[PDB]
Amino acid sequence: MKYNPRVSSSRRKSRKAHFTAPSSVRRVLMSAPLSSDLRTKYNVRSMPVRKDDEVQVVRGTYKGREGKVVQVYRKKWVIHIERITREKVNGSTVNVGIHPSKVVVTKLRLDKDRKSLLDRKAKGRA
Amino acid sequence: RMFAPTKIWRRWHRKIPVNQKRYAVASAIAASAVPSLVLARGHRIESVPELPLVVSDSVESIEKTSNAIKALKQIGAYPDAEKAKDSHAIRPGKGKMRNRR
């Protein structure tokens, strides 16, 4: 049960906040869980999805497909993966949007900030 | 404009005498001790050792929800809680969009 007086349980307000979120907030909202191996290694559960991250889809028609993320379309709330595509009536190839909550991160692109965030997340879990 | 537009100074509240409130509370407490009435109100009490159900004061020191569940199972009141949990559902009608989902 919510107790903080500065947070609202209103459905309308929560929906408005989610659908008007700026890019910086959308990045956090577009988080995905880490794989079992990565979760065990880093002691972290979920991370924001990045461009060059390796991802395995776990839901939908592409449940077995995996690859490298190639675009994070925050405006559309979807990511794009290397070979997860389809053919139009024209015959050309287009990427299929996949929601990050429905995929699993198998390999992270590590930098100084990424390592700092991983350490910060692991510290709280202890 | 609607006919007879609604106004805030409608008599929303009621002032019931304290003695009648206490009468109602006593009646409800007495009814809670009748197993037939408790069953008739929809509670699954077929496994409770007896009514009124009085438990040791050590339950007041429980801190974890798992221990609370274990106590409920021990006293035979768990099936009612399980029934309550299983009935969780979305409210039909317009009330589901009025923050009562």
Binding site: - | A26, I29, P52, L53, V55, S56, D57, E60
Partner: protein, 50 residues
């Protein structure tokens, strides 16, 4: 489900028919219009059936 302490406090809270309550000033539990609601015991008693 009553804890033992609350069940014990019930007597001091709601008093009884004879004496008054400590927590409710001057309150006494109400009495029903019927002393014994077992209608069969009254209708089939020796006094009535005679």
């Amino acid at each position: 489900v009553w804890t033992k302490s609350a069940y014990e406090k019930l007597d001091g809270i709601y008093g009884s028919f004879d004496k008054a309550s400590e927590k409710k000033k001057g309150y006494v539990l109400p009495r029903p219009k019927m002393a014994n609601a077992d209608l069969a015991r009254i209708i089939n008693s020796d006094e009535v059936q005679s």
